[PDB]
Structure 1
Amino acid sequence: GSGPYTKSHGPSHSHRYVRDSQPVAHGTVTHETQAASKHSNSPVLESNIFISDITDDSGTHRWVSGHITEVHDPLRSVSVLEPGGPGGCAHNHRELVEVTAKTRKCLVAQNGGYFDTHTGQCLGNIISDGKLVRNSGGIQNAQFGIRKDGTLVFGYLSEDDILDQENPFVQLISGVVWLLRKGEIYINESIQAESDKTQETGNFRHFVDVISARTAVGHDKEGKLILFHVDGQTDVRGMNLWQVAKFLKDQNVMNAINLDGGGSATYVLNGSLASYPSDHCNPSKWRCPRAISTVLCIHER
């Protein structure tokens, strides 16, 4: 449908290919790090609603709406959850964000990584509360992870990077497109890194350029984790990734990656749906949240 890939999810080329093709400005490191903030005497998070006027290239103005969530102690409060609960990805299980969220008393929960809509298979790298759920085998998509010592990681990782046991990843999830790198829009570089020069680069561009519902995760200079969500509907309402990156750039976000969007985009506040999903409740025309894969959860305990 609105997926970035037509055959298999992710590029076929290696991490060294990604490294050699990135701009000299970033040296030879294909990721960014930031020590997580440690505000253990603060509330867990801040949930912010925005309704903003967006201008597209044609000059027409549109209203968009969504949430920005700030997490003050990411190491202790952020979890990557399998659909429905532990073991969900092994069963190709799909489940609403709310249902999965209620397994951990999540204060805020958003849909997470990409999945195969036909088979329900989880995609990308997945580490959930210290447990390796899925090793993609070094597939080069944008990554977000939290290491055991509190380091936030954004960008492109090798299979060796994610399997390290010195300072192991305790949370890891994959998206598609690295939106911001070091406070700069990184979409053009992401297209080079995350699409196959061979198999249908056009469909990947349409995924970037079309407006839709979108979600993203990033961080600011203070080490706070930033969750982004904008409601929309592919080719009808919402934002394209250029607009998402600019919006986050103006929110002082340093690094951010794009997570699953379209009808998957869901914002759940303390177990209740608090967004407007795009899918229909067939055969009726009411709107319904989608059964999705992994979930990004922010919990109190």
Structure 2
Amino acid sequence: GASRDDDLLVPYPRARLRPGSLKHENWPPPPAGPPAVRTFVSHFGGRAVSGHLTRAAAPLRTFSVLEPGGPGGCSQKRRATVEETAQAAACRIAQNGGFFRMNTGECLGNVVSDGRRVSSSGGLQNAQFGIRRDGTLVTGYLSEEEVLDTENPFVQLLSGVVWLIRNGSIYINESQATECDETQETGSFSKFVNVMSARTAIGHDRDGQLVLFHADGQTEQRGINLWEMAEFLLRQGVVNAINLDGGGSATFVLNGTLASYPSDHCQDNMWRCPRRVSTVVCVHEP
């Protein structure tokens, strides 16, 4: 019927509730095509791992954040596979997006899909990547006051854990202090950053183009952590980037069909089944 949801990469085993200044970076839009998908099997720390790197021009026109099963997915606490959501949205390239609660399925953190707020952070502060109507690519942390600005408002936005790069500099350490909570253990979260597994990320490059990353693997066995990931991205010319859901949620859909190897297993156990995720990251051409 679906996945067994075994390969879990959880930043917080204890669900966070709804009860150092924090600012964000914005990159103006250079004036300007199809995406550029690149498959690879490269070595990190002596381990070969497979993944994908994507590039798109006109993020304001080719980028979109989708809800599980179409508009209103988060409002109904819905969960759908990247293929189902991508096939319905006719996305050239698609992969899983923000985090969620597996059992309930609601979308956690700020989320903007086509100028519509679908989820709110609720006082919590994590890494977020969004685009404003003027065409500026934003990354980092924003307050709900800035999120709600009606002058050059966000058109597409999602949130993830850790801010991977800021202005061409690694920003993991700066996120470890900001995005870590003290009520939960400090080593359950630090593992989420250091443990090896399949994960995804999103960012942009010096030329003003959107970037999407995906790496296959397994929790503790195969894949990469967040440290190894950022360096490869810097080698690829990304300015700002944030991490996204990974583990069994790591899914890369190309032309509406699965192109990655999910980490989770099927009920039959032998085979790997894609996970039903909340929001999806979509790239297309009108």
TM-score normalised by L of structure 1: 0.89
- Whether contact under 8 Å (1:18, 1:193) holds in the other structure is no
Report SS of the residue matched to 1:255: strand
- Whether contact under 8 Å (1:82, 1:295) holds in the other structure is yes
Q: 1:247-262, aligned counterparts within 5 Å?
A: 247-262=232-247
Summarize deviations over 1:261-289 as a string: whole Å, max 9, x none. Answer: 11101110110101111111112311111
Q: Which has the higher contact order (CA 8 A, sep 6+)?
A: 2
Structure 2 counterpart of 1:213, from 185, 198, 209:
198
In the alignment, which residue of structure 2 is the partner of 1:267?
252
State the alpha-carbon separation in 1 of the partners of residues 113 and 200 from structure 2: 19
In the alignment, which residue of structure 1 is the partner of 2:134?
149
- Whether contact under 8 Å (1:73, 1:224) holds in the other structure is yes
State the alpha-carbon separation in 1 of the partners of residues 241 and 18 from structure 2: 20
1:181/1:200 Cα in 2 relative to 1: closer, same or farther (>3 Å)?
A: same
- Whether contact under 8 Å (2:9, 2:248) holds in the other structure is no
Q: Determine what percentage of the aligned residue pairs are the same residue.
A: 60
Summarize deviations over 1:147-190 as a string: whole Å, max 9, x none. Answer: 11111110011010100001110001001111111111111111
Long gaps (5+) in structure 2: 1-7
Letter in 2 for 1:49: T
In the alignment, which residue of structure 1 is the partner of 2:15?
8
Letter in 1 for 2:125: Q
Structure 2 counterpart of 1:190, from 175, 179, 182:
175
In the alignment, which residue of structure 2 is the partner of 1:222?
207
1:237/1:36 Cα in 2 relative to 1: closer, same or farther (>3 Å)?
A: farther
In the alignment, which residue of structure 2 is the partner of 1:80?
65
Deviation at 1:121, TM superposition (A): 1.5
Summarize deviations over 1:221-258 as a string: whole Å, max 9, x none. Answer: 11101100001111111000000111111111111000
Report SS of the residue matched to 1:242: helix
- Whether contact under 8 Å (2:68, 2:278) holds in the other structure is yes
Letter in 2 for 1:216: A
Deviation at 1:38, TM superposition (A): 4.7
Root-mean-square deviation over aligned CA pairs:
1.5
Q: 1:125-204, aligned counterparts within 5 Å?
A: 125-204=110-189
Report SS of the residue matched to 2:181: coil
In the alignment, which residue of structure 2 is the partner of 1:281?
266
Deviation at 1:198, TM superposition (A): 3.4
Deviation at 1:35, TM superposition (A): 2.3
State the alpha-carbon separation in 2 of the partners of residues 2 and 300 from structure 1: 32
Structure 2 counterpart of 1:35, from 28, 39, 43:
28
Letter in 2 for 1:212: S
State the alpha-carbon separation in 1 of the partners of residues 224 and 122 from structure 2: 31
Deviation at 1:52, TM superposition (A): 0.3
Structure 1 counterpart of 2:37, from 25, 36, 47:
47
In the alignment, which residue of structure 2 is the partner of 1:237?
222
Is 1:116 equivalent to 2:101 in the alignment? yes
State the alpha-carbon separation in 2 of the partners of residues 2 and 143 from structure 1: 19
Deviation at 1:5, TM superposition (A): 0.9
Summarize deviations over 1:8-28 as a string: whole Å, max 9, x none. Answer: 34897xxxx443xxxxxxxxx
Letter in 2 for 1:157: L
Q: How many residues get paired? A: 279
